[PDB]
Recover the amino acids of this structure.
RNA sequence: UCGACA
DNA sequence: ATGTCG
């Protein structure tokens, strides 16, 4: 019941809030299809959200109907709402991530997609294929 | 508390 | 352990 023909995304950090990165892999092979350069300050949930949105953009530009797996219940909801409810403060250090997030929201209400966004069942299946 | 993450 | 989230 794992949909192997899929794109899997995850965040990695150093600290939380701290340095954030995310990437997307082919669920079947583990091939790395995209990896975001680390962002100096962010939260886990912002990174989880950016990874799904980047996944959507990636698949849409390639005309791909694959679903996206994420392990982040929060990020899956934020994507469905088109709104990332982060508590992270706004200052010059977090400006970069907040600009990414705002641009991701903006992409979500200027585009259509039917990509299913699916919860990766870590408890059953082990770690997501995009894990750091 | 429970759930999902970092 | 603590921080991010619902
Ligand atoms: Mg994750
Ligand atoms: Mg992980």
């Amino acid at each position: 019941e794992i949909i192997w023909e899929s794109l899997s995304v995850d965040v990695g950090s150093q600290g939380n809030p701290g340095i954030v990165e995310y990437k997307g892999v082919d669920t079947k092979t583990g091939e790395v299809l995209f990896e975001r350069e680390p962002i100096p300050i962010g939260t886990n949930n912002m990174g989880e959200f950016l990874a799904i949105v980047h996944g959507l953009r990636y698949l849409k530009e390639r005309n791909s109907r694959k679903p996206i797996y994420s392990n982040s219940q929060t990020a899956i909801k934020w994507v469905k709402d088109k709104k990332a409810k982060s508590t992270l403060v706004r200052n010059e250090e977090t400006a970069l991530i907040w600009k990414l997030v705002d641009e991701a929201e903006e992409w979500l209400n200027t585009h259509t997609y039917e990509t299913p966004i699916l919860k990766w069942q870590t408890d059953k299946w082990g770690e997501i294929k995009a894990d750091y």
Q: What stands out?
A: The beta strands of chain A are 7-15, 18-26, 32-35, 39-42, 68-70, 117-119. The pocket of magnesium ion (ligand 2) is lined by residues A 10, 131-132 (CB under 6 Å).
